[model samples]
Target: GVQLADHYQQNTPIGDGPVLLPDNHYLSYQSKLFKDPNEKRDHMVLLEFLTAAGITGEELFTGVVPILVELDGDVNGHKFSVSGEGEGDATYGKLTLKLLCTTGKLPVPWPTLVTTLVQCFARYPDHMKQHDFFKSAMPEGYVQERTIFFKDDGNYKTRAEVKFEGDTLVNRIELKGIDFKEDGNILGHKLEYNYNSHNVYITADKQKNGIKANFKIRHNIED
Candidate 1:
C-alpha cells in the first residue's frame, strides 16, 4: 500500500516501493532550496514522529556536530531500529538498520532509505549552517549522481549509479567483468520507475559457479 500524494489528500500512487506516509511528501527536484524546516515540508513530519516517540525535539539537531541518532520504536505495528552518526554531508553517514515484526516487508532500497534518514538531519536550516561548503560540494544542478559498489573481488566488481533529474530518476547497476560469462547465467533483472513518486529502482542478478550475485539500487527524491 505504498502511496504518493499530489495534494494533501489520498490520491496516492501505487507501487512496490516503500509506504509513503502523509508527511513523506514528494518534492520535485526543481524546487528551491529549503530555508526552514517548519515550512510545511515532508521532513517536518519526521520531527513530529520523533516527538511522538518520546524523543526530545532538539535531540536530532542540537549538541554535538557528528550526532549519534538512535531510533528504536514501532509505528502502526511496524517495528524497526535505525542507528547512525550524522555527518553533515551528501553521503550522510554509515548506518545500520534492523527490522522486526511486519517491517521486513519494506521495499525501499538503501539509497532512498538513507536519503530519508539523512533528510531528517538536513531539514534543519540551523544544522546546515555548519556545513557552508555544501554549496561548492553539491553543484547547482537539479541532477545528482551517486555510485555504490556492492561487491568487489579480485577480478570483478558490481556497481550501481543512482541518477536524478527533475521528474525522473534512474538506478542502473552492472557487473563490469568477465567472471560471470564463462560459468554463469544472467538470470534476470528489473528496472522500474514510479512516475508519481519520482522513484527509480534496479535489480541485477547473475549466478556464477553456484554462487549468487544480486545487486540493487534505488533513488527516490521524496523530501
Candidate 2:
C-alpha cells in the first residue's frame, strides 16, 4: 500500500538491496518480487533531480510524441516490471517490473510481460491511443494498418478513410492508384472496410505503377 514517493523516501539509503514487504497486496502476499533497493535509490535520485530542476511531466514530454521507456532485467536477479505516471511521481508503479521477471533456477518462473505491456500501453494519450490500436489489432485486418504506421514519417500518417460511398485504401503505399470493384477478377484487391462487410464494396479506377499517390485515415462520425 505504499505510494511511489513513500517507497522512495522510505528506502533512501543507498545500500538497501530491496524492500522486503507486501507492497502490492492483492496480487501478492508478503512478496519481495517488486522491491528493488537499487531501483528505489534510483527513483529517489530522479525525484531529487526533478525537485531541483522544477520541471513538470508535461514539460518533459513536450514535442516527444509516442514516448516509450523500456525497463529490462539482467540475469543477476535484478528483476521487476514497473512503470508509473511521471506526473504523479518520478517512480514506477508496483506490479512487477516487466513481463519476463523470471528465475534461472529455484522457484517457478514468473511471466508477467503481457500484463505489464497492457498496463504500460493503457496510459497512452488520445494521440497515441489510435496509433497503438492500429498496431495491436487482431480484430480488424490491421496488417496493412501496421505497415503504414512505421513507414509514414508524418505526425498524422496513419489516417485512412472508408466512407460508405468513399473510395481508395489509404495505406501508406501506392494503393491510391489501385482500383477495386474488379469483381470480374477474383484475385484483385478492393476497398472493403468503411461500411459493413458482405456489402457496400467500392469500385475505383485502376491506377498504374507510376503515379502520384496520397493517403489519409478518415474517421467517420455520427452527429
Candidate 3:
C-alpha cells in the first residue's frame, strides 16, 4: 500500500470517458455514494474525481448505499444505526469550488478535485488514519447521548447513550432516521446475517453466548 501523498505526486494518469462504478454496488467501508447535485446531474467526472482522491475503496468508485445494520448479542452487545444520508465531502467540495473558481462555468478536473480531499485530510490531520491510496480509518459516528427527565419531579430520570467500540472502520455504521426491512425482521431477538450470502438469517434457538448477531438492510439511493 503506497502513501496517498506519494500516489498523488506519482500523478497517475486517468483517461477521459464516461465514468462507471465498480461492479459491486456496496463497499464494506463506504456507506454512501457520490453524484452531481446540480441540474445536469452528471456523474462521469465525479466518478473520476473520487477515484483520483482515493476516497472510495480498492476498486475506485461504486454505487453507495446508506446502509443500516442492527445487532444484539452477548459478545458484542447492541449497536444503534445512524443515517449516512447527508451531504458529504464531494458535494460540498463541488459547490464550494464552483463559487471560488468560476462565478462562471468550468467542470472540475480530477487532479484539481483531488486536492479538495487531500487538503481536507491535511488540514484536519487528526480526523482519519490513512492506510494508503485505497484505505483509511475513521470513526463513523460521534459520541452521542440523550437525557430523560420525569414530568412529575422535573428531575433527571435516565440517560441513553450510543458509541462505537473495537475497530469502528470494520464494524461500525450509521442508521438514524431509517426503517428496518430485512429478512430477519420476523425473528425478533435472534437476528444475524450470513457471511457468504450476505443475507439476514433468523435462528430458531437462542444460544447462551453466541459469537455475535447482526442486521443489514439497504435503502434506495438518496433515501
Find the number of clashing residue pairs for candidate 2.
Answer: 15
Model 2 TM-score is 0.15
Candidate 1 per-residue C-alpha lDDT over 89-208 given as tens digits, one digit per residue, 9 for 90 to 100: 212312222212123432222222232232222232332232221121121111122332322211222232222222222222322222222211111111122212132221111121
- What would the TM-scores of all predictions be? 0.22, 0.15, 0.16
Once all C-alphas are superposed, what RMSD does model 2 give against the true structure?
Answer: 25.9
- Pairs of residues clashing in candidate 1: none
User: Cα lDDT of model 1 overall?
Assistant: 0.23
Candidate maximizing TM-score: 1
Ranking by lDDT: 1, 3, 2
Superposed by TM-score, candidate 2 places the C-alpha of residue 119 at a distance from the truth, in angstroms, of 8.4
Q: Which candidate gets the maximum lDDT versus the true structure?
A: 1
TM-score-better candidate, 1 vs 2: 1
TM-score of 1: 0.22
Per-residue error (Å), model 3, residue 72? 40
lDDT of each: 0.23, 0.19, 0.19
* lDDT tens digits, residue span 1-223, model 3: 1111111011110222211221111112121223346734222122111212222321111222122222111111222221111111322221112112212222221121121111111111122213221121112221211121111111111111122233221112221111222221211222121111122121111121111112233212110
